[PDB]
Design a protein around this ligand. Structure first.
Ligand code: FMN
Ligand code: FMN
Lengths: 217, 221
């Protein structure tokens, strides 16, 4: 399993140009299962993963997506990662995550809601800052993003994680096609999936591992 | 199509659960190293790698964190290893960190470097609206560490190692404990999250809950 994992870690690279060859529906389903089963802080699951097969919408997004030109053009599949806005402790979203989990009264539910108020007001210092609340739900999607990429790599499928686009212009294109509801949510990132047209030009580059990892004994 | 690999991934996805109480059994050096390699080798936006992953073995520091960590009480007590995910502050387009991330990749040659800096500038000012907003910039590097969080947890799961991702602590207070011990430079970096690792004492009583998959995943066209 070590050699296999290590092989997947070195196989995953950010590829921009893909083969025409399409990912099977079974491989695609596995990848999305990895997203769906990902853990999210407080089990909120304030996120959605959208397979964008619609070619006109891709064409509309393209001029606003500097980091995604070739991927939007060539990728087998293109996934949008959406995060919930305004997921404040006193929101229905949060209210609904407790019920889902089998929490009820308002003395087991209003109790944990007391903790979530403390968590957002004090612990993470974000309750009264909508951008920070959005950035918090958006962070959970990066967990699913890593899970999808690792699953992909273990299947020999290439990916590219993408932030290189104008967020507000992409959000409005998505809202106008009713792909998202801009009141409730906004895009966090994009992920392309496919088979690389060719081997990467330059080798994998990272900081020396000592500048990144360490032990405090 | 490749059924053996599907089974292995499917086993790991259903194995992973957020584990609060661990047994005493420790993770091997080889398994911890692979897990950390998963974080190190993770992609980050623009190749910045504005992150550090620290194995917190020191028991006194764990003991000090504990009263301010409502979500990590049994994890700090019982976990085999505990990892702090640290993100860089002030990663503005014109910062030394952003410049070094280009140099690392051999980009320097006047307007290869400068031309990228110009893209990173519009990216932070216009695409993400964060160039002049240090909290947003921090949250942006902190987002990258969640990719590593994911890769670490999947690697652990494939290894049979239980895990728990942790945000349930007072960030300012924990930051101050970490700076006080010279674990971080608070002017340059801040904690993003923690991850406990180990072997579950036992399987959970209450099976995994998720939203119906139609409420999370969909296809446009
Ligand atoms: C969240 C994040 C966003 C990214 N956005 C883009 C994108 O905008 N366009 C692109 O071509 N590559 C994008 N990438 C890929 C990075 O440039 C790449 O991960 C980095 O250069 C490290 O190299 P490697 O993953 O190929 O090993 C992104 C990576 C991360 C994780
Ligand atoms: C970023 C993040 C932070 C989390 N923080 C905590 C924590 O502070 N304390 C805790 O007991 N569980 C924590 N969890 C675990 C979640 O409660 C758990 O992932 C969620 O309820 C889904 O259940 P499952 O992972 O067992 O499938 C966290 C999860 C995520 C991804």
């Amino acid at each position: 399993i070590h050699h296999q994992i290590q092989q997947a870690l070195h196989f995953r690279t950010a590829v921009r140009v893909y083969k025409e060859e399409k990912i099977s529906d079974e491989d695609l389903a596995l990848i999305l299962d990895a997203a769906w089963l990902s853990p999210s802080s407080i089990g909120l699951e304030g996120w959605r993963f959208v397979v964008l097969d619609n070619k006109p919408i891709k064409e509309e997004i393209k001029p606003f997506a500097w980091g995604a030109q070739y991927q939007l053009e060539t990728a087998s599949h293109f996934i949008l990662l959406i995060a919930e806005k305004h997921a404040r402790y006193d929101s229905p979203a949060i209210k609904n995550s407790l019920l889902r989990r089998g929490i009820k009264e308002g003395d087991g539910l209003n109790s944990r809601l007391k903790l979530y108020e403390s968590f957002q007001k004090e612990d993470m210092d974000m309750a009264d800052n909508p951008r920070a609340l959005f950035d918090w739900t958006a962070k959970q999607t990066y967990i699913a993003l890593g899970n999808m990429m690792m699953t992909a790599a273990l299947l020999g499928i290439d990916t590219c994680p993408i932030e290189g686009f104008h967020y507000d212009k992409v959000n409005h294109i998505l809202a106008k096609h009713n792909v998202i509801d801009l009141e409730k949510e906004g895009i966090a990132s994009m992920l392309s999936l496919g088979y690389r047209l060719r081997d990467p030009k330059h080798a994998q580059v990272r900081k020396p591992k000592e500048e990144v990892m360490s032990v405090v004994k």
